[PDB]
């Protein structure tokens, strides 16, 4: 369990499920946002290598796992950013500025959140964030455009419904992926099948005109030290995105990881956790120097 405890917090009829350890102290608290179709426990690999003197919060994103799934919820990046601000206000996480960490769709929400509520965030860590406008499409984005041409919504690579589709999703999302036995693939996809209608609705909403490039559209408003962590072998969100952010945001440190695909937090958890803590210390040192 790593000392992480699951709790639920309510905003009227909406509930957020989150895991946590430690308590608000002198250092900035850390709020972690997972990616598309995942949940708060994808952060456990990194938490295992994080120090115990930090206040860590890992929240299930809107409609995922223990957080409310409602047909009336606004699943656009703007609406998810707003839900995250309600959750933050619920826990009083912004009592003093906090460090905000996000991966992929969570990375996009994190970037847009720092642009919407700049006084809430002390520093940002964006792990292969979605929401950028690339000059050319990688094979995955060319596949999505091809699927749009036949409206084959049942073939979205990140929404598998069969063992063979699950094996393709596992290959696309990680650099090293040896073949898994059919029984294990079947078990992995069965836990996701009841949630595929929601993932299909969420996916179409985050790739819609209003959300597809919202991080790129808001990155001029990010005013805090930002760390970018990206895997050079990312087959989902191309690693060229790291330079687009770095050249558009001041005080930006880029960490390109070798032998690493889209699932950074699962593939390189030790290096990722080390980079997270090192960046936190360098931000504190520059803040102590800048005084007066
Ligand atoms: C149906 C329209 C097709 C056009 C696509 C336009 C560009 C957007 C394409 C891909 C972005 C995918 C972002 C999904 C979240 C990343 C996965 C994750 O969170 O791990
Ligand atoms: C990933 C593509 C799978 C097949 C999608 C079938 C067509 C869905 O429809 C399209 O979805 C887009 C994305 O939300 C919208 O931008 C378009 O307006 C809409 O017509």
From Swiss-Prot:
Matches recorded under InterPro entries: AB_hydrolase_1, AB_hydrolase_fold, AB_hydrolase_sf, Epox_hydrolase-like
Protein name: Monoacylglycerol lipase ABHD6
Outcome recorded upon mutating residue 69 to H: Decreased bis(monoacylglycero)phosphate (BMP) hydrolase activity
Residues annotated as catalytic: 104, 234, 262
Enzyme Commission number(s) from the entry: 3.1.1.23
UniProt similarity note: Belongs to the AB hydrolase superfamily.
Recorded GO MF terms: monoacylglycerol lipase activity; phospholipase activity
Its membrane topology: Single-pass type II membrane protein
Localization per record: Late endosome membrane; Lysosome membrane; Mitochondrion membrane
Binding-site residues, (9Z)-octadecenoate: 36, 105, 262
């Amino acid at each position: 369990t790593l000392g992480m405890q699951v709790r639920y917090v309510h905003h009227e009829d909406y509930q957020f499920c989150y895991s946590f350890r430690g308590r608000p102290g002198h250092k900035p608290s850390i709020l972690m946002l997972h990616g598309f179709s995942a949940h708060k426990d994808m952060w456990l690999s990194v938490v295992k290598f994080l120090p115990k003197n930090l206040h860590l919060v890992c929240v299930d994103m809107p409609g995922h796992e223990g957080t409310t799934r409602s047909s009336l919820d606004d699943l656009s990046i703007d609406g998810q950013v707003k839900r995250i601000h309600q959750f933050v206000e619920c826990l009083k996480l912004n009592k003093k500025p906090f460090h905000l960490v996000g991966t992929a769709m969570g990375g996009q929400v994190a970037g847009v959140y720092a642009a919407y509520y700049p006084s809430d965030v002390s520093s940002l860590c964006l792990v292969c964030p979605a929401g950028l406008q690339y000059s050319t499409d990688n094979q995955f984005v060319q596949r999505l455009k091809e699927l749009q041409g036949s409206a084959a919504v049942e073939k979205i690579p990140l929404i598998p419904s069969t063992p063979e589709e699950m094996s393709e999703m596992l290959q696309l999302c990680s650099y090293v992926r040896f073949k898994v036995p059919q029984q294990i693939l079947q078990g992995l996809v069965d836990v996701r099948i009841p949630h595929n209608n929601f993932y299909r609705k969420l996916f179409l909403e985050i790739v819609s005109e209003k959300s597809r490039y919202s991080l790129h559209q808001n990155m001029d408003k990010i005013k805090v030290p930002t760390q970018i962590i990206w895997g050079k072998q990312d087959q989902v969100l191309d690693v060229s995105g790291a330079d687009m952010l770095a050249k558009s945001i001041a005080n930006c440190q880029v960490e390109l990881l070798e032998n690493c695909g889209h699932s950074v937090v699962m593939e390189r958890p030790r290096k990722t956790a080390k980079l997270i803590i090192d960046f936190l210390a360098s931000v504190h040192n520059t803040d102590n120097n800048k005084k007066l």
